[PDB]
Amino acid sequence: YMNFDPKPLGDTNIFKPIKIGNNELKHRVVMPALTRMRAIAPGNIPNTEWAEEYYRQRSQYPGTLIITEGTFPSAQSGGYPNVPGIWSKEQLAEWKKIFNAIHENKSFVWVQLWVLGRQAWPEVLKKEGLRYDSATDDLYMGEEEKERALKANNPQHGITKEEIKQYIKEYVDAAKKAIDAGADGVQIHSANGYLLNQFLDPISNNRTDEYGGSIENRARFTLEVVDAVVDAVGAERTSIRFSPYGTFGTMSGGENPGIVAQYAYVIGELEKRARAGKRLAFIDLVEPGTNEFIYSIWKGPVLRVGNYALDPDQATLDSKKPNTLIGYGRSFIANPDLVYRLEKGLPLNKYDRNTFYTFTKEGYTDYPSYEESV
Amino acid sequence: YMNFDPKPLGDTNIFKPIKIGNNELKHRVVMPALTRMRAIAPGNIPNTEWAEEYYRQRSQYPGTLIITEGTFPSAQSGGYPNVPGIWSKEQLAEWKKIFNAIHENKSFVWVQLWVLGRQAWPEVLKKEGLRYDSATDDLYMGEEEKERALKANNPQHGITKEEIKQYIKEYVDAAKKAIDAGADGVQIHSANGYLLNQFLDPISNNRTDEYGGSIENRARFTLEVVDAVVDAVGAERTSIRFSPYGTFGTMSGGENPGIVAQYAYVIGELEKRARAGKRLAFIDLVEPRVTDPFLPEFEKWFKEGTNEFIYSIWKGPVLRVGNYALDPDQATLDSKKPNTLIGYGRSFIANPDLVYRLEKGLPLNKYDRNTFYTFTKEGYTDYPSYEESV
Ligand SMILES: Cc1cc2nc3c(=O)[nH]c(=O)nc-3n(C[C@H](O)[C@H](O)[C@H](O)COP(=O)(O)O)c2cc1C
Numbered sequence A: 001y002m003n004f005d006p007k008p009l010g011d012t013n014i015f016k017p018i019k020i021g022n023n024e025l026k027h028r029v030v031m032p033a034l035t036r037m038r039a040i041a042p043g044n045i046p047n048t049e050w051a052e053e054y055y056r057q058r059s060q061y062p063g064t065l066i067i068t069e070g071t072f073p074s075a076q077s078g079g080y081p082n083v084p085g086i087w088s089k090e091q092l093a094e095w096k097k098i099f100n101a102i103h104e105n106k107s108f109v110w111v112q113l114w115v116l117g118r119q120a121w122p123e124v125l126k127k128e129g130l131r132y133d134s135a136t137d138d139l140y141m142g143e144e145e146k147e148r149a150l151k152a153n154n155p156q157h158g159i160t161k162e163e164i165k166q167y168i169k170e171y172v173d174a175a176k177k178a179i180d181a182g183a184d185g186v187q188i189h190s191a192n193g194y195l196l197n198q199f200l201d202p203i204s205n206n207r208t209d210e211y212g213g214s215i216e217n218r219a220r221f222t223l224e225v226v227d228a229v230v231d232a233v234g235a236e237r238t239s240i241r242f243s244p245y246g247t248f249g250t251m252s253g254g255e256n257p258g259i260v261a262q263y264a265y266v267i268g269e270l271e272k273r274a275r276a277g278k279r280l281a282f283i284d285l286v287e288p289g290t291n292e293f294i295y296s297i298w299k300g301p302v303l304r305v306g307n308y309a310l311d312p313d314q315a316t317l318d319s320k321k322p323n324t325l326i327g328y329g330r331s332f333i334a335n336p337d338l339v340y341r342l343e344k345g346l347p348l349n350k351y352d353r354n355t356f357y358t359f360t361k362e363g364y365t366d367y368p369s370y371e372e373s374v
Numbered sequence B: 001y002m003n004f005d006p007k008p009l010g011d012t013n014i015f016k017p018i019k020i021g022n023n024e025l026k027h028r029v030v031m032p033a034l035t036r037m038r039a040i041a042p043g044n045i046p047n048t049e050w051a052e053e054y055y056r057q058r059s060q061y062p063g064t065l066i067i068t069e070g071t072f073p074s075a076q077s078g079g080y081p082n083v084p085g086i087w088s089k090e091q092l093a094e095w096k097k098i099f100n101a102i103h104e105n106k107s108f109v110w111v112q113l114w115v116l117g118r119q120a121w122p123e124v125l126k127k128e129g130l131r132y133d134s135a136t137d138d139l140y141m142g143e144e145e146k147e148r149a150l151k152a153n154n155p156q157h158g159i160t161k162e163e164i165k166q167y168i169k170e171y172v173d174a175a176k177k178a179i180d181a182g183a184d185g186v187q188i189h190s191a192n193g194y195l196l197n198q199f200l201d202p203i204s205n206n207r208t209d210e211y212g213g214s215i216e217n218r219a220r221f222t223l224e225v226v227d228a229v230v231d232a233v234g235a236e237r238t239s240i241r242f243s244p245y246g247t248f249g250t251m252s253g254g255e256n257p258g259i260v261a262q263y264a265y266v267i268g269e270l271e272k273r274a275r276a277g278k279r280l281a282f283i284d285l286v287e288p289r290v291t292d293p294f295l296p297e298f299e300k301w302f303k304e305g306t307n308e309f310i311y312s313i314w315k316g317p318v319l320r321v322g323n324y325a326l327d328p329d330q331a332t333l334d335s336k337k338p339n340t341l342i343g344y345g346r347s348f349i350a351n352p353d354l355v356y357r358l359e360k361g362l363p364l365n366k367y368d369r370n371t372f373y374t375f376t377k378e379g380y381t382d383y384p385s386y387e388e389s390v
């Protein structure tokens, strides 16, 4: 079991119901998007053989919001062979099964749409005849990644206006397919140093067209994606994720003092859209400065994710803020019955980091329920 | 006495000493800038006859930070005839006396440099052959104000690049003169809807040159003033005041959800300058006002925000001002945040010994709004110090 003194959350805000988009959540413990690398290659196909049971376990407490693992909305968005896609018929046939399992449990599923940019593996992309994309040609994540891209004869490529538009069409296509197959909503991944974050952050975007050179310009791609997705599926079925203080992927974080203003701009623009009648279902923030700033800008639901499993005091406190959901990542990997365990203040299984990203049933669906653990 | 149950603050962080700029404060109760209009017209001359005593009284607790009333750095900056300036020999002679009285009391004095813009009285300016200035020709603060300007034949004038540079020169001139006359520092007024704020806020600035059209351009003037003043007198003798949620002067406040970004940007630019070796002594923020209880449910939450975001950006001292007199628990709470100073406005008008009273949890005199801006010693130097109840 994890090393903390467990405390029951059942009489806190974390266990009050809330409406998020179209869904009546019975509580506010959320499963955030978690990359697990169990999808089948080739074809980036969801591995229903193992994945259906994974999402069934974790949606077992009725009225849970589940956000899927990052899912590629197109081939060119991708680059990791064992991450699922949602653009092909054969992918969607498998997703439908997963969604059905979550719905049988009377829980909800939101698909996270994930586009890699410079975090992709350039030799895998090259094999598939695909570009190694980012905001720029020359701002590589690091010298090792640069040497990787050069060795693959797939140098980083700052995307054109036309290729930007093609991405936006791919977000749209993937969002409509997800909803058509039964998903309750989609989440636009704009965090953790992937493609849209690469535009947002000045460390990875010094473009001199309208997509770089200012806070407004750096937010433009993200906001065009939001607007296109909102138009296709409705704001009630759309969410977005940010990581203001993240440095993963060679992003700025707090080391750049202008980082908060970048996020306050983009969230303000989402707020302006909401006042005009198109309010996103929720904004998801990665916890580290602090994320307190959001509450002065966005007047909609907020999901906060990061470090809450070992800190029920801080989860309790943050949930007193208005319309705040509390996400659990690593602890949800390791605890199928996390919601129950949180509600009752039971000990939590320790996670096994060695099986986070392996192509195995082990460390995926064999973590025990509280009863089994005893 | 104010109708509240006072609580003592002397064992809180409010009464822990702190170094601001060159000055060792004994405590964190600050007198913020307070316009009182006792200056002599013509000449915008500090009224030493009364003003020396006013500032002597309120500086009596040793080691208090006093920020002066807003003070014009040149004539063209002004437009209120009973507000002081600090450009002329006559003005400076009286300021010297005022600063010496604060220093005799072992306290410190920072001159707020105040530039009016469209808040000015256009007929007052016209009589002196001065412009009625703002970011734009056409975005007036309201219809009444537009008529006032037109009847005075002094229409609003969006200032040129050369004129922006001449204002910056006047801030510099005034800062150097202020420091020469013995001021401990200066505070750039960039709040409450005055000239600099009119540039910061999109509601009053849609210029299509490098001073409008984006967060960065809207900030340009304020940051030009900061940089010029810092280079002239040093960062340790320079401060700045913002009012992110203010609507005074027909500013946006929280009703515009893009307002926080504007301020996070400017403050981040200051943090950048700090990290490179030039840290402003402090940033002064006006707190959000108490909300209108009659706002409908939705518009209540729309307007709502706090200044807590500053602590995620700026790593230096913060002065927070607004609504603390009647809420010692909140002052106590806000003072436990890093390097935080607490300002008292209306209550320092009314309580010359306000520091002592907050230290020991004594009743506070009521303020009389009728004499906030009257050219009188009455309601200026006649509020009494605490006199024991029998
Ligand atoms: C194995 C693993 C996979 C992850 N995959 C994703 C992903 O697909 N998309 C995403 O936005 N964040 C992802 N994250 C970040 C988590 O959602 C969450 O923000 C992070 O784990 C912090 O939460 P925790 O402290 O409760 O683990 C992942 C984290 C881990 C540990």
Ligand SMILES: Cc1cc2nc3c(=O)[nH]c(=O)nc-3n(C[C@H](O)[C@H](O)[C@H](O)COP(=O)(O)O)c2cc1C
Binding pocket: B032, B033, B034, B035, B036, B068, B069, B070, B112, B189, B191, B192, B241, B286, B321, B322, B323, B324, B325, B343, B344, B345, B346, B347, B372, B373
């Ligand atoms: C009569 C009066 C004069 C003021 N003059 C100034 C001024 O010259 N400069 C300034 O930045 N703020 C000025 N303010 C605003 C105060 O500094 C302070 O932000 C405000 O009074 C709220 O604080 P309080 O609730 O303790 O009064 C003034 C306020 C009042 C009531």
